[PDB]
Amino acid sequence: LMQFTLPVRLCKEIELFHFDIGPFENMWPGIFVYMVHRSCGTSCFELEKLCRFIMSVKKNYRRVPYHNWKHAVTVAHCMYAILQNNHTLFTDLERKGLLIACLCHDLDHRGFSNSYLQKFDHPLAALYSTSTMEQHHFSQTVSILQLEGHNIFSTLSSSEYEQVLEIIRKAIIATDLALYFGNRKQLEEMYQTGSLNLNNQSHRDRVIGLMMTACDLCSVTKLWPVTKLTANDIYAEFWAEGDEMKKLGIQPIPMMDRDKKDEVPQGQLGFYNAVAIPCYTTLTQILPPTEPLLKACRDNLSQWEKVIRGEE
Ligand SMILES: Cc1cnc(C)n2nc(CCc3nc(N4CCCC4=O)cn3C)nc12
Ligand SMILES: [Mg+2]
Numbered sequence: 001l002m003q004f005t006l007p008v009r010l011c012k013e014i015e016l017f018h019f020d021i022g023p024f025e026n027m028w029p030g031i032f033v034y035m036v037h038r039s040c041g042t043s044c045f046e047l048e049k050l051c052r053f054i055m056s057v058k059k060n061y062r063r064v065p066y067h068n069w070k071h072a073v074t075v076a077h078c079m080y081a082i083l084q085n086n087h088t089l090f091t092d093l094e095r096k097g098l099l100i101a102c103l104c105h106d107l108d109h110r111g112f113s114n115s116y117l118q119k120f121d122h123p124l125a126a127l128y129s130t131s132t133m134e135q136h137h138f139s140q141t142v143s144i145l146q147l148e149g150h151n152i153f154s155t156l157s158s159s160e161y162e163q164v165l166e167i168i169r170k171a172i173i174a175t176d177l178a179l180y181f182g183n184r185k186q187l188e189e190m191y192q193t194g195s196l197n198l199n200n201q202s203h204r205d206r207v208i209g210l211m212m213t214a215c216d217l218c219s220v221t222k223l224w225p226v227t228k229l230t231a232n233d234i235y236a237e238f239w240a241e242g243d244e245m246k247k248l249g250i251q252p253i254p255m256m257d258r259d260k261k262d263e264v265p266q267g268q269l270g271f272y273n274a275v276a277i278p279c280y281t282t283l284t285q286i287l288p289p290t291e292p293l294l295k296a297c298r299d300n301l302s303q304w305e306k307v308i309r310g311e312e
């Protein structure tokens with residue numbers, strides 16, 4: 001049958017956590033199919049249905065600076081690297097669900113936070129009072145699965161299908177960073193007191209939630225030039241929301257105020273110390289082969305430190 005194969009450099013480097021999917025948009029679908037075939041099997045999905053699903057997902061990502069189709073595919077590649085370094089830890093349905101969840105997790109993102117939607121009084125803030133954009137992304141995922149010729153899960157039973165969509169729903173909701181802090185603290189306590197139990201469904205749920213955060217934040221785990229240039233896209237969004245906050249007559253938080261361009265290096269320090277390092281530290285304790293993510297994050301923290309010291 002029909003393998004996808006990549007050029008030699010991509011074939012080797014796609015296996016590493018720090019892989020950058022490159023600036024050729026037209027190769028990203030092929031890169032995703034390649035990752036599904038190796039992490040799931042050539043039998044998981046009918047190629048035609050999967051190709052049609054990938055292309056409708058791409059179409060429902062918007063042309064925003066950071067929360068775009070490249071982000072979707074980047075977050076899927078980090079999940080692929082986690083899954084490939086932990087062969088035997090995950091069920092068949094989890095392998096199927098989690099790459100889809102990653103591809104779908106920011107579907108139809110508009111470049112604005114949950115907080116901006118509530119202050120603007122967007123209709124989505126009335127339909128979904130918490131994790132507003134994340135419930136929207138899961139709703140968009142179901143919509144696309146229900147288009148003609150797009151049911152990639154069509155060969156699962158009613159109960160397997162229900163389990164896979166429930167894995168995807170939880171994985172997507174878990175990308176609401178507001179929920180990460182409490183999830184990581186619970187996992188930290190569980191790991192240390194030795195209660196962490198991977199046969200406990202509500203435990204696996206938490207561990208998959210942390211994987212989702214780790215993949216979502218994975219720009220901090222890349223080579224420094226990738227990390228630094230991705231940060232510019234992240235801030236281009238934040239500062240546009242800042243502008244929109246000022247139009248509602250609301251002072252944005254410093255994170256979203258382009259007037260504080262200069263403090264970006266110190267903003268990154270707080271974010272590595274408060275968010276990223278704790279995330280990859282707890283993930284590495286639970287899933288030891290994800291250490292390369294923690295090591296790369298620590299490398300990038302030390303680069304932001306060099307920027308503050310004026311050494312870069
Ligand atoms: C969600 C996400 C994901 N990946 C990355 C790399 N980032 N970087 C961020 C912003 C960090 C941050 N910057 C500030 N700034 C900047 C100057 C004033 C200020 O306060 C505050 N904070 C918390 N957010 C993320
Ligand atoms: Mg999101």
Ligand SMILES: [Zn+2]
Pocket residue numbers: 071075105106175216
């Ligand atoms: Zn995301």
